[PDB]
């Protein structure tokens, strides 16, 4: 397994930035992802959370309206738009991966055929808040 | 055979009533659930229902095994006002039943009471 | 904007016993499971405790943890020199975003 992040670098106060997290060695559309941050000398802190398809998005209370998260089934990366950079935002931003896989239970079918593999209909399994794989992360710096 | 006996009665249907009583003598001297499996069953039950119906109707008034039996009902003059020489010598049986065809229910009822009344008077000869 | 009350640093001598606690509130741990993690100095974090009662196949039986009401406690036996690292507490619930708060860190 290997998780690599992108979008990091030096930024200026008040500007914008979009982080990326390339996923590999596993089924991208079958696991949820989490974004964390840990200030130097402090503890970790959740940033955002997304499902396997991106229909459910959740963030922190302090970044409502400014921080967003989305994924893409054709390019397999996680986006995180960070606006209004603040000096208290410098932290160890990592890319997390959930463990619970959305195992499908009812696929769409076609009587008189029963051979065509149609998309899924009723899947089970959401986010659990457990990160089994942690990338190297990209360090951000604002001043 | 129930079928071969009802066909012999229909022989000589064009002869007069006076000669039909003796013509039958000279004619008898020389002598599983499919659609087809259900109509045969429905026909045998209909054959039995027609044989005893004409047989049980006889048993009500005296006659049970006879053929030329006589009854004790006086012949009216309103049902048929023709002489004996014309009925039994110049008319077939099919034509005769077209004349008295209306006096049928009034006759079968009169034949029954004329025989049931006989049993009451006969069995009262001991009291 | 909740926080997990944890000791910033505790003494860890080879052979003694170290307890790591995690006290929160009712909204974050009173109705949801709790987890645990370890972040060694200069290394990436890793999963240690999931579902509050199950452990991955990569860790020995020395790592153990439990919870009691609104507070959880981590009890580990067999302390060595290489175990001195930063341990965290973690709660997560999809209902409200006030339950997703990491621990402040426990340096052993």
């Amino acid at each position: 397994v290997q998780l690599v992040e992108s979008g990091g670098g030096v930024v200026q106060p008040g500007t914008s930035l979009r982080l990326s997290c390339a996923a590999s060695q596993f089924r991208f559309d079958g696991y949820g992802m989490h974004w964390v941050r840990q200030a130097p000398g402090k503890g970790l802190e959740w940033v955002a959370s997304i499902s396997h398809d991106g229909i459910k998005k959740y963030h922190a209370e302090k970044v409502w309206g400014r921080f967003t998260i989305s994924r893409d089934n054709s390019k397999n990366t996680l986006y995180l738009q960070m606006n209004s950079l603040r000096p208290e935002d410098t932290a160890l931003y990592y890319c997390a991966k959930d463990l619970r896989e959305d195992e499908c239970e009812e696929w769409w079918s076609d009587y008189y055929d029963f051979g065509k593999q149609l998309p899924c209909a009723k899947s089970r399994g959401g986010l659990v808040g457990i990160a089994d794989n942690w990338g190297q992360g990209t360090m951000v710096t604002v001043s | 055979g129930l079928g071969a006996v009802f066909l012999g009665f229909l022989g000589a249907a064009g002869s007069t009533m006076g000669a039909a009583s003796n013509t039958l003598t000279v004619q008898a001297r020389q002598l599983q659930l499919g659609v087809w499996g259900f109509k045969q069953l429905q026909a045998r039950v209909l054959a039995i229902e027609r044989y005893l119906e004409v047989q049980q109707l006889l048993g009500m008034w005296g006659c049970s095994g006879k053929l030329i039996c006589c009854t004790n009902v006086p012949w009216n003059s309103s049902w048929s006002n023709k002489t004996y020489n014309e009925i039994w010598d110049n008319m077939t049986w099919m034509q005769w039943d077209r004349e008295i065809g209306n006096y049928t229910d009034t006759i079968y009822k009169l034949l029954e009471v004329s025989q049931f009344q006989q049993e009451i008077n006969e069995k009262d000869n001991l009291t | 904007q909740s926080v997990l009350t944890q000791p910033p640093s505790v003494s860890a001598a080879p052979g003694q016993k170290v307890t790591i606690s995690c006290s929160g509130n009712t909204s974050n741990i009173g109705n949801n499971f709790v987890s645990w993690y370890q972040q060694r100095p200069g290394r990436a974090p890793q999963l240690l405790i999931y579902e509050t009662d199950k452990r991955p196949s990569g860790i020995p039986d020395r790592f153990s943890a439990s919870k009691s009401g609104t507070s959880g406690t981590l009890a580990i036996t067999g302390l060595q020199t290489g175990d001195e690292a930063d341990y965290y507490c973690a709660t997560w619930a999809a209902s409200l975003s006030s339950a997703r708060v990491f621990g402040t860190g426990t340096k052993v």
Binding site: D113 | A13, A20, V54 | -
Partner: protein, 431 residues
């Protein structure tokens, strides 16, 4: 002076009843007519001669043909209930031409013995049996949007064997013997029996097949001889021959559709493809439409001209008959019905596999292809005609109904019941 009763008087009155089958024992074949479960007949049937009697009976008001129509219909439904259907065959086809056209070589998807796998098979279907969605090309069966279609079993046959209708014990079937007795008329040479003669149940539209030549003086039976709807049923006295075949040598491919189902479709056509054709004799037929034209003139006092069929569909317009297990559809339009040495008339016929027989929207059959070379040699005894209107009178063939194929053989019969109880006055009282 006294009433007396008689048992066994010849008194009868017509009524209705239920007649059963009767056929001599021959042999298992599992024919479509359940004669293996039918009572055998008698070698010497009773046929009395009723003298001095003139019974009058109607032909079109008869009820023996309404029970026969409700019998054959219920007979085919019995031999088709345990059959396999062609429901998984209502798939979009993809056809092309045949070898060195009315024969299409179609290919389609067909589910194998288990639903998870599908293979592409091919078969041969007649052009008269498939309809195009849009002429480009993709085709579809002709009965996949009206009702369900079933395939008859390959073991059962369509061979018309003679069956007798016998009245139950206590009834009597009258039978006339007059020479020139048409449909309705008081017959004087009346005779009684208990079982009908040889009745071969056949089907046809324009002509009659394997009938029974009654007597001389060809009869013209009808109901309203001065109308435009009543179908004239001619009854010939000198039948001519009609022979036709299928000069192809076709195989029988056994394809598989659905889990546990299969049907036999056309495979290869050995040799060159040739057209079926019937060979009604020429000189023997020309004098048949000359004796009829001299017999039908007397009932109209006009000269008559013959036109072709009307036109439109195939089951109601032109000839349609069965031959050895394969349903034919000829035209006979303007080869001998266009008039007023020893050559022969050759009629181009067409063959179909799916038949909407009995004139309903449902219960469509599918005759499997018979491998080999089918050959028949039948007789035609009587035609079916129909007026036009309007000088000269124009006649043309038309199967106005299907029951008329049986009124040509059940026209001299009448079912009655006997009442052997008689009443007559006499000079004999109860002693």
């Amino acid at each position: 002076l006294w009433v007396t009763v008689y048992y066994g008087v010849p008194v009868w009155r017509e009524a209705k009843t239920t007649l059963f089958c009767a056929s001599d024992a021959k042999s298992e074949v599992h024919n479509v007519w359940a004669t293996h479960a039918c009572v055998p007949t008698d070698p010497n049937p009773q046929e009395l001669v009723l003298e001095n009697v003139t019974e009058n009976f109607n032909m079109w008001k008869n009820d023996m043909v309404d029970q026969m129509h409700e019998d054959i219909i219920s007979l085919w439904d019995q031999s088709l209930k345990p059959c396999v259907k062609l429901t998984p065959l209502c798939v979009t086809l993809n056809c092309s031409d045949a070898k060195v056209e009315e024969i299409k070589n179609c290919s389609f998807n067909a589910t194998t013995e288990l639903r998870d796998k599908k293979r592409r098979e091919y078969a041969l279907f007649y052009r008269l049996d498939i309809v195009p969605l849009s002429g480009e090309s993709e085709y579809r069966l002709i009965n996949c949007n009206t009702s369900v279609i079933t395939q008859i079993c390959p073991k059962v046959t369509f061979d018309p064997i003679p069956i007798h209708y016998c009245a139950p014990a206590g009834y009597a079937i009258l039978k006339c013997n007059n020479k020139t007795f048409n449909g309705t008329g008081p017959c004087n040479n009346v005779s009684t029996v208990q079982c009908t003669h040889g009745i071969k149940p056949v089907v046809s539209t324009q002509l009659l097949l394997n009938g029974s030549l009654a007597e001389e003086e060809i009869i013209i039976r009808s109901e309203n001889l001065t109308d435009n709807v009543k179908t004239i049923i001619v009854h010939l006295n000198e039948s001519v021959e009609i022979t036709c075949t299928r000069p192809n040598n076709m195989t029988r491919k056994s394809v598989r559709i659905g889990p546990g189902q299969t049907f036999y479709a056309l495979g290869d056509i050995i040799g060159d493809i040739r057209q079926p054709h019937c060979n009604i004799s020429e000189i023997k037929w020309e004098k048949t439409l000359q004796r009829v034209s001299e017999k039908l003139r007397e009932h109209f006092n006009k000269t008559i001209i013959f036109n072709q069929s009307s036109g439109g569909d195939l089951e109601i317009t032109t000839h349609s008959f069965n031959c050895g297990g394969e349903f034919f559809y000829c035209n006979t339009s303007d080869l001998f019905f266009n008039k007023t040495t020893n050559s022969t008339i050759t009629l181009p016929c067409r063959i179909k596999q799916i038949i909407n027989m009995w004139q309903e929207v449902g219960r469509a059959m599918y005759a499997p292809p018979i491998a080999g070379n089918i050959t028949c040699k039948s007789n035609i005894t009587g035609l079916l005609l129909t007026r036009d209107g309007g000088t000269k009178e124009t006649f043309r063939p038309g199967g106005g109904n299907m029951r008329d194929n049986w009124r040509s053989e059940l026209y001299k019969y009448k079912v009655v019941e006997v009442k052997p109880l008689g009443i007559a006055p006499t000079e004999c009282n109860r002693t």
